[PDB]
Design an enzyme around this catalytic site. Sequence first.
Site, PDB file in Angstrom:
ATOM      1  N   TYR A  65       0.829  -1.202   0.000  1.00 27.33           N
ATOM      2  CA  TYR A  65       0.000   0.000   0.000  1.00 27.33           C
ATOM      3  C   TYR A  65       0.851   1.233   0.000  1.00 27.33           C
ATOM      4  CZ  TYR A  65       0.792   1.041   4.973  1.00 27.33           C
ATOM      5  OH  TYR A  65       1.351   1.420   6.176  1.00 27.33           O
TER       6      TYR A  65
ATOM      7  N   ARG B 255       7.459   3.621  -5.290  1.00 31.36           N
ATOM      8  CA  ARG B 255       7.630   2.751  -4.108  1.00 31.36           C
ATOM      9  C   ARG B 255       6.591   1.646  -4.081  1.00 31.36           C
ATOM     10  NH1 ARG B 255       7.999   5.225   1.852  1.00 31.36           N
ATOM     11  NH2 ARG B 255       5.756   5.229   1.532  1.00 31.36           N
TER      12      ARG B 255
ATOM     13  N   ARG C 231      -8.335 -20.406  -0.876  1.00 31.15           N
ATOM     14  CA  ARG C 231      -7.305 -20.253   0.147  1.00 31.15           C
ATOM     15  C   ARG C 231      -6.184 -21.283   0.069  1.00 31.15           C
ATOM     16  NH1 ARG C 231      -5.499 -21.660   5.245  1.00 31.15           N
ATOM     17  NH2 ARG C 231      -4.575 -19.841   6.350  1.00 31.15           N
TER      18      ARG C 231
ATOM     19  N   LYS D 231       6.514  -2.190   2.055  1.00 27.98           N
ATOM     20  CA  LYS D 231       5.380  -1.520   2.684  1.00 27.98           C
ATOM     21  C   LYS D 231       4.146  -2.427   2.550  1.00 27.98           C
ATOM     22  CE  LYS D 231       3.272   3.121   2.931  1.00 27.98           C
ATOM     23  NZ  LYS D 231       3.564   3.340   4.342  1.00 27.98           N
TER      24      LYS D 231
ATOM     25  N   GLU E 163      12.671   2.671  13.541  1.00 28.42           N
ATOM     26  CA  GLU E 163      11.749   3.714  13.058  1.00 28.42           C
ATOM     27  C   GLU E 163      10.588   3.789  14.066  1.00 28.42           C
ATOM     28  OE1 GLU E 163      10.186   2.516   9.208  1.00 28.42           O
ATOM     29  OE2 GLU E 163       9.986   0.442   9.834  1.00 28.42           O
TER      30      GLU E 163
ATOM     31  N   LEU F 124      11.321   1.078   6.824  1.00 30.39           N
ATOM     32  CA  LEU F 124      10.773   1.535   5.568  1.00 30.39           C
ATOM     33  C   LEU F 124      11.569   2.785   5.121  1.00 30.39           C
ATOM     34  CD1 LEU F 124       8.435   1.239   3.543  1.00 30.39           C
ATOM     35  CD2 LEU F 124       7.216   2.987   4.731  1.00 30.39           C
TER      36      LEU F 124
HETATM   37  C1  LIG Z   1       6.724   1.798   9.458  1.00 30.08           C
HETATM   38  C2  LIG Z   1       6.726   3.124   8.710  1.00 30.08           C
HETATM   39  N1  LIG Z   1       7.876   3.845   8.589  1.00 30.08           N
HETATM   40  C3  LIG Z   1       7.965   5.040   7.951  1.00 30.08           C
HETATM   41  C4  LIG Z   1       6.831   5.630   7.374  1.00 30.08           C
HETATM   42  C5  LIG Z   1       6.936   6.940   6.690  1.00 30.08           C
HETATM   43  O1  LIG Z   1       7.032   6.822   5.256  1.00 30.08           O
HETATM   44  P1  LIG Z   1       6.547   8.053   4.361  1.00 30.08           P
HETATM   45  O2  LIG Z   1       5.103   8.263   4.768  1.00 30.08           O
HETATM   46  O3  LIG Z   1       7.437   9.180   4.782  1.00 30.08           O
HETATM   47  O4  LIG Z   1       6.820   7.520   2.994  1.00 30.08           O
HETATM   48  C6  LIG Z   1       5.519   4.958   7.432  1.00 30.08           C
HETATM   49  C7  LIG Z   1       4.241   5.527   6.821  1.00 30.08           C
HETATM   50  N2  LIG Z   1       3.559   6.366   7.795  1.00 30.08           N
HETATM   51  C8  LIG Z   1       2.434   7.063   7.525  1.00 30.08           C
HETATM   52  C9  LIG Z   1       1.963   7.466   6.305  1.00 30.08           C
HETATM   53  S1  LIG Z   1       0.382   8.085   6.516  1.00 30.08           S
HETATM   54  C10 LIG Z   1       0.404   8.029   8.193  1.00 30.08           C
HETATM   55  C11 LIG Z   1      -0.618   8.568   9.119  1.00 30.08           C
HETATM   56  O5  LIG Z   1      -0.366   8.807  10.346  1.00 30.08           O
HETATM   57  O6  LIG Z   1      -1.742   8.852   8.608  1.00 30.08           O
HETATM   58  C12 LIG Z   1       1.521   7.474   8.288  1.00 30.08           C
HETATM   59  C13 LIG Z   1       5.469   3.659   8.119  1.00 30.08           C
HETATM   60  O7  LIG Z   1       4.287   3.012   8.199  1.00 30.08           O
END
Ligand SMILES: Cc1ncc(COP(=O)(O)O)c(CNc2csc(C(=O)O)c2)c1O
Lengths: 280, 280
Positions: free
Chosen positions: B31, B50, B98, B145, B177, B201
């Site tokens: 996603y 990505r 499945r 992701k 992270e 990520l």
């Molecule tokens: C484990 C992990 N590490 C880093 C990030 C940040 O990636 P970018 O959103 O900067 O591409 C993310 C994405 N975070 C995120 C995107 S929208 C959102 C929110 O709070 O709505 C959050 C992640 O899930």
Amino acid sequence: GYTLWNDQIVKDEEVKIDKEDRGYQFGDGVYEVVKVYNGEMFTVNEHIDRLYASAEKIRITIPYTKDKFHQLLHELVEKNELNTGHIYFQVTRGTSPRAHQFPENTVKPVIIGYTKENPRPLENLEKGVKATFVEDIRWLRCDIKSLNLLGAVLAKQEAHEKGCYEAILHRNNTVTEGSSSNVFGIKDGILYTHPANNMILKGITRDVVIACANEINMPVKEIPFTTHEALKMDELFVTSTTSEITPVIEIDGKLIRDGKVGEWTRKLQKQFETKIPKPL
Amino acid sequence: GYTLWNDQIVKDEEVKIDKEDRGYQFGDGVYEVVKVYNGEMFTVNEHIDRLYASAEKIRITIPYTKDKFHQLLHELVEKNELNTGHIYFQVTRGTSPRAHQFPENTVKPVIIGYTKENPRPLENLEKGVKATFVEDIRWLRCDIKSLNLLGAVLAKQEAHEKGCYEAILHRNNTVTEGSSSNVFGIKDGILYTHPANNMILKGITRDVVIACANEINMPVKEIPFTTHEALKMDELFVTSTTSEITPVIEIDGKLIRDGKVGEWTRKLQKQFETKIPKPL
Ligand SMILES: Cc1ncc(COP(=O)(O)O)c(CNc2csc(C(=O)O)c2)c1O
Ligand SMILES: Cc1ncc(COP(=O)(O)O)c(CNc2csc(C(=O)O)c2)c1O
């Protein structure tokens, strides 16, 4: 066919999943698979107990009692006229606008259950199968039977691409479990298997096999072994609700002993056969 | 309003997700989230790149070109009349009976996208937030992701119950992270962040911030730091598509320096502000 949807039994085509079901967006849910033999559910109580335990581990509250869940499964088996195969059922935290944190306790879990006719894998039980070692890259709560199954998907695919039935996983060469099974080795008439901590699923079939070993006075040692030790075992097999006790005769082109199903594996298979429902 | 479903923008009520969609049973999917500022998408090309990269890493083939995908996202934003908020979009391996292993290449992936209005987090950008340390128990392919998000769900819920904005994760006492963000530390005017390997990520916001640091002649070292070292930073902030540059001013009741937003974080916030879409 018919699908269990919450507490209703509905025609398959009526079932619709919401895009913001947390099972679809986060894998935020748990599941079970129960084998049915000639119309009778095998170890259904144990599977229901484990579903509720898995749910509790991630703080999902299933809204029905275990007795009502049991009744629903019974009704699902009868409506579908399932003879030999399995019931699949899962519970997700429910549907709510996407956010990582839990929604308000106002959100009800979504329960899906359905059946599939599926024979015992008699050929595998008799002849044994090939397996391959694959690094365990999964999360560290493998004791929870969750819908986060992407590591197991990739491991199973790799096995299937090599013409193998199962991927035997390992964490830095320590054997854990299979991508969808538990792994046992036998050496000098002693049964070995990884202990039930956060590194493996505590399989229902695993537990039945340990009970079978106790019944036939075979020593059991729940201690882990390495990939290198596994290759030197007298016998090896994997267990799951659908695979039962499936002998493993070869790993990555290397035979296990002579490539034949071993004596103790056969004895355990014989004791296991006494536990399952038969017609009759 | 309107939902992107496969290759069509349809009314949300028309969307039908199957119980055997592999996104629902295995979390077998990837996603993206894209921020939209006053009707204009931010870094959309980088997010599409990505998405295709995450998909390729688990061997999903997206059935249309990046150009087509960009086109559909623009239409989605217009049909919904999104001013400031985000687009969420996901791709799953598709619907198939499945089984862990991949289905045949005859199975089309399922694509779902929709919008949400969501303002810039003004208060957090200005005042900073509290965080808490949570051990990282996730799988070992955090560079993908994926929809396997249960580790992040439990971590964020832990932070929310302690009244914190974010869980800062650590593996072997090394900060990796956030549960949904990347983590940066500043010490003596140098910017530190965990390198982009399998442990994190590689955030789009992270890469923008590193570009911004380069533009203001601030040294950047992609070297990991421990929890002990994090607590001794002059400044700390987290980044994500919706958090932008959110200062972290306290972790588990311990203040980062003086508990105020630092000068370098402000300089980076200012530099970041120059990159966002502004139709006045
Ligand atoms: C484990 C992990 N590490 C880093 C990030 C940040 O990636 P970018 O959103 O900067 O591409 C993310 C994405 N975070 C995120 C995107 S929208 C959102 C929110 O709070 O709505 C959050 C992640 O899930
Ligand atoms: C990671 C992991 N470890 C062990 C097992 C075995 O658990 P039980 O089925 O014996 O409870 C499982 C469950 N596997 C499984 C259940 S039905 C089935 C199949 O191939 O149809 C497979 C698992 O996913």
